[PDB]
């Protein structure tokens, strides 16, 4: 899983 | 799964 | 798993 | 890019 | 980039 | 980059 919260 | 919350 | 919180 | 050669 | 050759 | 050759 990959996630970016920006 | 991939997710971006921007 | 990879995650970036920026 | 992601690749699987099997 | 990610690759698997199997 | 990540690679596995198996």
Curated annotation (Swiss-Prot), chains A, B, C, D, E, F:
Name of the protein described by the UniProt record: P3(40)
- Per the UniProt record, the source organism is Homo sapiens (Human)
Gene this protein is translated from = APP
Span within the parent record: 698 to 703 of 770
């Amino acid at each position: 899983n990959k996630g970016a919260i920006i």
